[PDB]
């Protein structure tokens, strides 16, 4: 269960690719996270986004260990 602060750290890390498309997995081995902008928020400019309203997260499990 990754904390919201750690999820926000990944959002900042991939700030250049953050979109409504699921991000790459945060790790290449083990349990990581994937993040995206909600499809229903696709038409909001970047500065009008909000973590609690507009961001989705899901767990990913990579096997390249």
């Amino acid at each position: 269960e990754p904390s919201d602060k750690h999820i926000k750290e990944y959002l900042n890390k991939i700030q250049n690719s953050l979109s409504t498309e699921w991000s790459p997995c945060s790790v290449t081995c083990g349990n990581g996270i994937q993040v995206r902008i909600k499809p229903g928020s696709a038409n909001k400019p970047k500065d009008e986004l909000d973590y609690a309203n507009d961001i989705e997260k899901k767990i990913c499990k990579m096997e390249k260990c």
Partner: antibody
Amino acid sequence: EVQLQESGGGLVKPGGSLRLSCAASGFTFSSYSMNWVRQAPGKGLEWVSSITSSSSYIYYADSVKGRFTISRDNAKNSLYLQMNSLRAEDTAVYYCARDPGIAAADNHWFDPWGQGTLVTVSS
Amino acid sequence: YELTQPPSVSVSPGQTASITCSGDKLGDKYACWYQQKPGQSPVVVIYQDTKRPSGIPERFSGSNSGNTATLTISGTQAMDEADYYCQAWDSSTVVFGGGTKLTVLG
């Protein structure tokens, strides 16, 4: 060169009105959230108001709610602060500030700041 | 939401200055730090808890966890004397700490 230049400060009577402007250059003004911050002489920084790129979301500090109105004209690369019902305690240097943060991560900071313009509320 | 800083921190030249900024679950937020010298506009020296803008001397570092964001100046020089303000964000409201005046003694 990213630059913000405030104008409109000066002396204003108690209860009077004053409009500050902030001219932006060197960045795509129309896509950034913009902020006003003030600092009373010898005191600290106090956030005043914010407005997003499209003006769709606006917020005020409780100390100015109902008296100040923030606005912007993207075609003119300009940010405005209309100040009404001014009181002696609104005397401060008023700063224009750009927010180049990552709103999706709730990550907000100000850079750059304008040079500030001094508003003196006095009889 | 309120942020609290010590009013004054003093340090000898070349020593480390530790300036704190405190608030309820501050570590769950992003903190940034502004430097203000007399008669000048504030300048960000740390943002996003730990990030240093280009042009800011490498001796400025930052951290944020728990209920404390910490601005650390290693090998403090006289030119680092200034007021330092922390700043965070709470429900679209921007909050500033009250400021810390850094004095380089000796």
